């Protein structure tokens, strides 16, 4: 259970984006909107697991810039296949976060 213990004791939060036109822009957006956080990316081809420690923010403005076309925050649902963390969403951004530190 040392492997299992180490797996459980993480604070990784962030979107899992299904393969498509949002993968690259979301990764770039994660890097830009969370400066001084290390963004990790695990590529499973059909989806990509994007994470930061404790909190990871995606702003509508940056995502729109990185995607290169007009974009409303609610559209992220077309490609947000799952996520780690609790979610806080509005018209300007989505925030993935944990209340606890493990």
């Amino acid at each position: 259970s040392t492997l299992a213990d180490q797996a459980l004791h993480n604070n990784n939060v962030g979107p899992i984006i299904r393969a498509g036109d949002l993968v690259e822009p979301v990764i770039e957006t994660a890097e830009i909107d969370n400066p001084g956080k290390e963004i990790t990316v695990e590529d499973r081809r059909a989806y990509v697991r994007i994470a930061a420690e404790g909190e990871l923010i995606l702003t509508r403005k940056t995502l729109e810039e990185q995607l290169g076309r007009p974009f409303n925050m609610q559209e992220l649902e077309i490609n947000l296949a799952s996520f780690a963390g609790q979610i806080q969403a509005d018209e300007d951004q989505i925030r993935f976060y944990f209340d606890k530190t493990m």
């Binding site: 649902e77 780690a84 609790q86």
Partner: protein
């Protein structure tokens, strides 16, 4: 100009009122609502974190389907059916059969909440949930339908839940328990929280990874799009959980989560486990079943469970050991009794595969490998009679799946039995027996396939009688080795 959702959203869920012409309990009966005596006013604190609204829903969901269907259309001639490894085709057959009409059943889980939850936000989000599951059931009938003309086993995408075939009974016993057979709050906790943030990621995203590796983009694109809906409506569970805890019902909440997670595990171990470690071609295995479990269940789900304020399940250590062991035995059972399946199990034990299995599960060859050694031998010697069963496996009274253990060098197997109201029941784990004991009225008079066979309900009492009882309608429909045993040639 248009006004932003945040400014009018509260009015969409300002729908609770104080009943006057019937009582609160008549309007929200406990057996359907499961409010555990928590008064209406407390439920208005419920705050769904993944909101949507009707105009956005229809627009967004239209876009989701346009992509799913366009992709299917553009790839009809990719010859997935003709050119794919038959193990991959069986993965599709198994998935669609075990899932399509179950999705449609989930509409009823969402509807139970839409009508009977005391939380106004939950009733609205369940309404989109009803719509989502309708989408999912219709997609997963529409997609396999084109393959009917190619293969009768694809008819089971529709037929499975109408049959008494063993995996269909296992699927229905589980879904009827956590989706359609309980009160709204139980559904919120067991379905939307436990099952849907807990395990469905495995089957709909883990499998999509393997599908992409296999080059089946129609399917990967399909199921990954489906899970985008889950990501939203699954978020009805957490806030019910938090509300129960705030109102002194943490023990009740913990027990429901504990029960649902284990029930889901046993079913996923028999369907997704063999798919990921055996049916899916070796070169297409993005990760092993265990690795996916550690990603999705341990690393993501259980961490979220802790964040919300719940505890690891009491059976944590048993669960971890099970991850190492259970599905290997389930695979063996599904394959040995393959003729009762509606898909064609791949044995998946060529030397190259056994090397991978040993690397992913050290000690495999000294365990399951011992049985496959015997099996492989009979095949290399045309004793095909020894590779087909002449009796029934002993079946769990909870999960409806055979009672298994670890074979080979360190043989170890345990059945957990229970006398109850004069009847003897058998369970494949402490947890399954515990689940029964949590709610006997739910389970006590259910009879599994073995029980029915011994009670004389299956006639004639022979392999053919059972296959008839299970709803098979032609020879072609019955499961066989995926590669017609051609894997023996690598041995």
């Amino acid at each position: 100009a248009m006004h932003p959702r945040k400014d009018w959203y509260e009015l969409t869920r300002a729908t609770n009122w104080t009943p006057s012409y019937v009582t609160e309990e008549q309007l929200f009966p406990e057996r359907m609502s499961g409010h555990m005596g928590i008064p209406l006013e407390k439920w208005e604190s419920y705050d769904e974190p993944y909101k949507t609204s009707y105009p956005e829903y229809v627009s967004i969901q239209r876009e989701k389907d346009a992509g799913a269907y366009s992709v299917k259309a553009a790839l009809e001639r990719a010859k997935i059916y003709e050119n794919s490894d038959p193990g991959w085709i069986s993965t599709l057959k198994s998935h669609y059969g075990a899932i399509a009409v179950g999705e449609y059943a989930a509409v009823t889980g969402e509807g139970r909440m839409a009508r009977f939850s005391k939380a106004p936000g939950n009733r609205n989000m369940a309404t989109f949930g009803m719509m989502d599951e309708l989408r999912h059931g219709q997609l997963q009938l529409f997609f396999p339908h084109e393959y009917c003309k190619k293969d009768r086993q694809f008819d089971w995408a529709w037929r499975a839940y109408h049959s008494n075939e063993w995996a269909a009974i296992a699927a229905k016993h589980f879904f009827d328990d956590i989706i359609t057979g309980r009160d709204a709050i139980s559904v919120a906790i067991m379905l939307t929280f436990s099952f849907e943030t807990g395990f469905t990621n495995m089957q709909f995203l883990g499998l999509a990874a393997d599908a992409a590796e296999a080059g089946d983009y129609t399917f990967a694109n399909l199921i990954s799009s489906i899970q985008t809906d889950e990501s939203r409506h699954a978020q009805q569970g957490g806030p019910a959980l938090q509300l129960l805890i705030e109102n002194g019902k943490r023990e009740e909440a913990q027990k429901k989560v504990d029960m649902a997670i284990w029930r889901a595990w046993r079913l996923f171990a028999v369907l997704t486990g063999p798919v990921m470690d055996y049916y899916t071609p070796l070169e297409d295995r993005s990760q092993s079943f265990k690795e996916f479990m550690y990603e999705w269940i341990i690393g993501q789900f259980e961490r979220s469970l802790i964040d919300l304020g719940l505890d690891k399940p009491w059976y944590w250590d048993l669960f971890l050991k099970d991850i190492d062991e259970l599905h290997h035995s389930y695979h063996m059972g599904v394959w040995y009794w393959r003729t009762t399946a509606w898909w064609n199990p791949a044995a998946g034990v060529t030397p190259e595969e056994r090397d991978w299995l040993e690397e992913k599960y050290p000690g495999w060859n000294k365990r399951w490998g011992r049985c496959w050694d015997v099996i492989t031998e009979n095949v290399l010697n045309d004793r095909m009679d020894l590779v087909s069963p002449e009796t029934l496996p002993s079946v769990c009274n909870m999960s409806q799946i055979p009672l298994v253990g670890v074979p080979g060098d360190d043989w170890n197997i345990e059945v957990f039995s229970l006398e109850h109201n004069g009847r003897l029941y058998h369970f494949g784990s402490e947890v399954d027996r515990w689940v029964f004991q949590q709610d006997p009225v739910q389970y006590q008079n259910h009879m599994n396939i073995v029980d029915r066979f011994l009670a004389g309900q299956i006639q004639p009492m022979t392999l053919e009688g059972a296959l008839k009882y299970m709803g098979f309608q032609s020879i072609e429909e019955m499961g066989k080795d995926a590669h017609d045993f051609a894997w023996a040639d690598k041995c």
